[PDB]
Amino acid sequence: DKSDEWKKNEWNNWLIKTEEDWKLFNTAVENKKNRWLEKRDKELEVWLMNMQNRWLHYRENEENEYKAEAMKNSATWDDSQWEQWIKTEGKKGMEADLKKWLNDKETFLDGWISKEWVQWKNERMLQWLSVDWKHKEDETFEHYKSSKFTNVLHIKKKKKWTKWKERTNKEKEEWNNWVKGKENLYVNNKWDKWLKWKKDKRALYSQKFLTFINKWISDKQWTVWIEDQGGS
Incomplete structure (x- = not known):
């Protein structure tokens, strides 16, 4: 039915709407990341209270190389x-525990x-590819060489195949360029707010x-500790 030029314009309009939809996706991601970071403030505060209480005792059911x-x-x-x-090995253990806590949260954040x-x-991509x-x-x-070539000699390519191949090649290139312009926000991403949060919390909690x-x-x-372990 439809001409190659109609199909080109359908792609152009679809890419425009995709960029618009991306803005909503990105705003939702930023809102989710900010709320996640807020919840890490609460979790870190709870983590410190639990760690401090654990350092008050050394009960016999505890296995702890530092203690x-x-x-x-x-x-x-x-x-x-x-x-x-406690000033040397004790602090080193507390600092190491905080370091691994932050790395654990960073690992979750990047995967999520x-x-x-x-x-x-x-x-x-599925939305575009599944258009009728x-x-x-x-x-x-x-899938068929019957649709690519004019006859069984397999020399001359059909005009409509060439139009399809050239159009789909250029649209794949446009899509790949668009994706690569956004991908750094989510893949191997350096979130400055998280990096500043880590440095600030390390200094405060130290x-x-x-x-x-x-x-x-x-x-x-x-x-x-001694009395917990059986001492008098």
């Missing part, structure tokens, strides 16, 4: 050696956002660790 490394000296260490340990983009791109006249011409020309360590020392909290 064992200190407690194998618990018969011989004076106060100054407990203080030196990248998969939403993969899904959206494909939903878009588009699916029809693609089935006609992709000082929170030091404040907690000072209280642990002032309360001689290792005496509770």
Whole structure:
């Protein structure tokens, strides 16, 4: 039925609407990312409260290499050696736990956002490829050499095949260029807000660790660890 020029214009209008629809998708993604980051504020605050409470005790059902490394000296260490340990190895363990918490959240974020983009791109592509006249011409020309060549000699190509191949080639190139202009937002993406959030939380929580360590020392909290482990 329809001419090659009509089919070109149908693609042009479809790409315009796709760019418009992308703006709504991107706004929804940004809103979801911002709300996710807000919820990490709450989760990090809860995480710190739980970690601090865990450092108050060393019950016999706990397996912890850091606490064992200190407690194998618990018969011989004076106060100054407990203080030196918590300020060096104690803080190093708290910093390592926070580092892996942040890496875990970064891993989830990248997988979640990248998969939403993969899904959206494909939903878009399926919408175009399943258009009735588009699916029809693609089935006609992709699978049969009968529709490509004028006769069994397989020399001269049919005019309509050439029109289809040239049109679909250029539209695939346009689509690929459009996708590559947006892909960096979701794939291997550097989210500056998350990077600044990580650096700010590391600095704040490092000082929170030091404040907690000072209280642990002032309360001689290792005496509770010893009693938890059976000591008198």
